[PDB]
Amino acid sequence: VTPIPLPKIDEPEEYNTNYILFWNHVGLELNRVTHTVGGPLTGPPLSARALGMLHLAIHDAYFSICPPTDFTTFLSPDTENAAYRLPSPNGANDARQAVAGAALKMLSSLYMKPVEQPNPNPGANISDNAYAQLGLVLDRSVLEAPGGVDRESASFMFGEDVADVFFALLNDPRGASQEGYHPTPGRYKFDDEPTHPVVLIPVDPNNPNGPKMPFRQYHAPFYGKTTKRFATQSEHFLADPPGLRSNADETAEYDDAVRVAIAMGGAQALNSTKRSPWQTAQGLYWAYDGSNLIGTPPRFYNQIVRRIAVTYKKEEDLANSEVNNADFARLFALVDVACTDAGIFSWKEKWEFEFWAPLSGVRDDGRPDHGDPFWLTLGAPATNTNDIPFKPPFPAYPSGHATFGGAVFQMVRRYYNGRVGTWKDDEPDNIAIDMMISEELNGVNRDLRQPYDPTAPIEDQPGIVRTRIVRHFDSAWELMFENAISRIFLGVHWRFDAAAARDILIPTTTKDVYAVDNNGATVFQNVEDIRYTTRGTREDEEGLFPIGGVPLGIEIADEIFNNGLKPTPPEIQP
Numbered sequence: 402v403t404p405i406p407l408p409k410i411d412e413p414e415e416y417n418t419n420y421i422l423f424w425n426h427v428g429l430e431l432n433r434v435t436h437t438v439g440g441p442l443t444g445p446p447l448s449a450r451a452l453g454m455l456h457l458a459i460h461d462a463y464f465s466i467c468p469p470t471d472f473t474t475f476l477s478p479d480t481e482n483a484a485y486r487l488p489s490p491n492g493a494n495d496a497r498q499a500v501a502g503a504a505l506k507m508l509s510s511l512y513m514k515p516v517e518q519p520n521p522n523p524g525a526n527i528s529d530n531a532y533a534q535l536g537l538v539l540d541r542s543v544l545e546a547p548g549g550v551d552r553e554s555a556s557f558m559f560g561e562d563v564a565d566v567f568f569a570l571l572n573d574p575r576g577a578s579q580e581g582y583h584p585t586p587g588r589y590k591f592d593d594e595p596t597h598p599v600v601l602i603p604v605d606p607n608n609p610n611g612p613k614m615p616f617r618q619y620h621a622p623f624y625g626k627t628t629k630r631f632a633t634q635s636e637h638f639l640a641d642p643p644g645l646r647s648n649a650d651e652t653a654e655y656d657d658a659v660r661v662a663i664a665m666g667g668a669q670a671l672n673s674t675k676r677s678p679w680q681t682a683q684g685l686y687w688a689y690d691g692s693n694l695i696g697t698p699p700r701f702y703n704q705i706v707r708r709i710a711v712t713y714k715k716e717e718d719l720a721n722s723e724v725n726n727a728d729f730a731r732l733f734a735l736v737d738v739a740c741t742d743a744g745i746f747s748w749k750e751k752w753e754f755e756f757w758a759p760l761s762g763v764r765d766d767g768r769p770d771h772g773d774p775f776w777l778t779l780g781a782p783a784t785n786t787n788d789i790p791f792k793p794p795f796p797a798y799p800s801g802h803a804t805f806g807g808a809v810f811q812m813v814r815r816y817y818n819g820r821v822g823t824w825k826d827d828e829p830d831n832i833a834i835d836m837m838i839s840e841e842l843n844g845v846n847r848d849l850r851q852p853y854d855p856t857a858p859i860e861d862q863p864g865i866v867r868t869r870i871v872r873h874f875d876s877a878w879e880l881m882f883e884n885a886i887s888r889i890f891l892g893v894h895w896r897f898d899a900a901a902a903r904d905i906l907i908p909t910t911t912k913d914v915y916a917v918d919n920n921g922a923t924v925f926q927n928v929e930d931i932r933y934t935t936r937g938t939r940e941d942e943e944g945l946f947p948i949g950g951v952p953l954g955i956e957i958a959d960e961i962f963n964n965g966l967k968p969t970p971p972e973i974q975p
């Protein structure tokens with residue numbers, strides 16, 4: 402089959418001399434390829450799950466052979482429960498081959514053709530070409546693996562066994578099912594996106610030029626409530642969003658939110674848009690909304706973590722260093738598991754409240770002096786395609802980006818505290834990074850004038866090229882913040898979807914109404930001064946809960962970390 406020409410990644414090639422990073426890289430490649438061909442594990446919550454499973458398998462394969470001191474393996478070989486019983490090395494002592502077997506097995510189980518009946522219903526939507534392209538990635542990775550892959554080694558086979566365990570235990574085949582779900586129209590209620598009310602998909606995925614059919618998508622409406630958690634030791638909840646349930650009386654907040662939404666997230670040329678060119682860059686930088694050759698947010702968060710990992714490694718040798726191998730194996734397991742659970746809980750709350758997107762909220766507002774029936778947002782970029790911007794097919798509260806980021810970057814902060822610098826676990830850190838380039842703005846990817854051609858490299862395809870922006874960040878606190886507000890700039894999330902408006906915006910004398918600059922643009926607090934302290938109430942539960950995705954993610958990361966990466970007790974599983 403014709404292999405898809407993938408654009409070059411902006412990262413020192415030395416990174417892949419380390420087999421832990423190499424396998425992480427292979428996971429990231431499958432991520433972007435599956436989103437280009439429409440293969441399995443697409444979308445934000447599930448794509449994060451794939452990475453969590455991959456790194457959990459790698460983590461235990463490595464630490465079984467090279468036992469850790471300050472912590473232990475996720476699963477143990479002495480568990481009476483067969484489902485949580487980790488296999489034993491029994492002679493195997495080649496960590497490199499162990500990791501290879503775990504990674505290869507997991508990724509293959511995740512991305513290959515479900516010959517075991519699973520193809521029906523679940524996989525009945527993915528074309529043969531999709532699987533073929535994914536297979537190519539897998540096949541060549543074996544050949545590019547640093548140190549090679551010896552499929553006949555005992556260590557390799559051990560790794561495979563480890564993968565089988567984690568796969569059977571955590572795989573959620575029907576995770577993204579939407580069968581039986583239908584929106585419940587009304588104020589504040591999620592429903593089909595006005596600029597993309599329906600989509601025409603081929604009746605037969607193997608004949609994309611053949612007859613089409615109308616399709617309305619709702620992304621994983623049942624996943625969050627039915628899926629198995631990874632390492633969280635409890636259920637997490639967010640305060641009711643402004644306008645709903647116990648907070649239905651927070652009208653000043655909601656009204657100002659509508660106001661900030663129009664000014665900060667509208668289309669580039671609308672007279673009501675007050676967003677600056679720089680803020681537009683900040684919005685697109687963190688997108689990764691499932692585009693061709695790009696993939697989803699988890700892929701970007703891992704690209705960032707890869708840089709942090711190498712920038713702050715203990716030993717200079719990337720290839721032959723167990724200190725580095727252990728460090729990376731541990732870090733990525735912590736990070737990707739937190740990302741996985743962040744997805745579960747953000748999706749759980751998303752479909753719990755079913756809060757509507759700013760596009761619908763502004764248009765359907767109804768009040769002549771508050772709404773704008775013809776508003777358009779900067780929207781989620783439709784990169785490497787000729788389609789227009791959209792709003793991802795799922796409820797708004799809370800922001801998945803914000804939750805993912807909160808978890809990933811809080812985990813990084815907990816892990817490096819006292820090593821890169823010293824800070825209170827709830828205050829700004831000093832984990833700075835340089836030369837960080839997003840594939841949304843790399844001088845290569847673009848907005849095409851014609852349909853994407855998968856047989857030709859992106860450079861030979863006409864379109865407006867995205868300006869190359871090289872960033873530097875002073876801390877993971879900043880990363881966490883900007884990643885969250887970027888969605889406000891795109892106009893796909895309300896301010897409260899990120900965090901409590903009181904914690905991120907500059908207040909005025911009027912309660913719930915925040916400050917704007919000379920030209921009407923919203924003013925944010927300085928990153929160093931931001932503290933996610935503002936909590937709210939829930940109708941169905943007593944107490945105060947976090948508002949927005951960031952606080953939720955931070956909470957999930959602290960929990961997992963504090964428990965040293967321990968499985969969710971099967972008793973509290975759904």
Ligand code: VO4
Binds near residue numbers: 793893
């Ligand atoms: O991922 V959002 O849920 O931030 O579009």
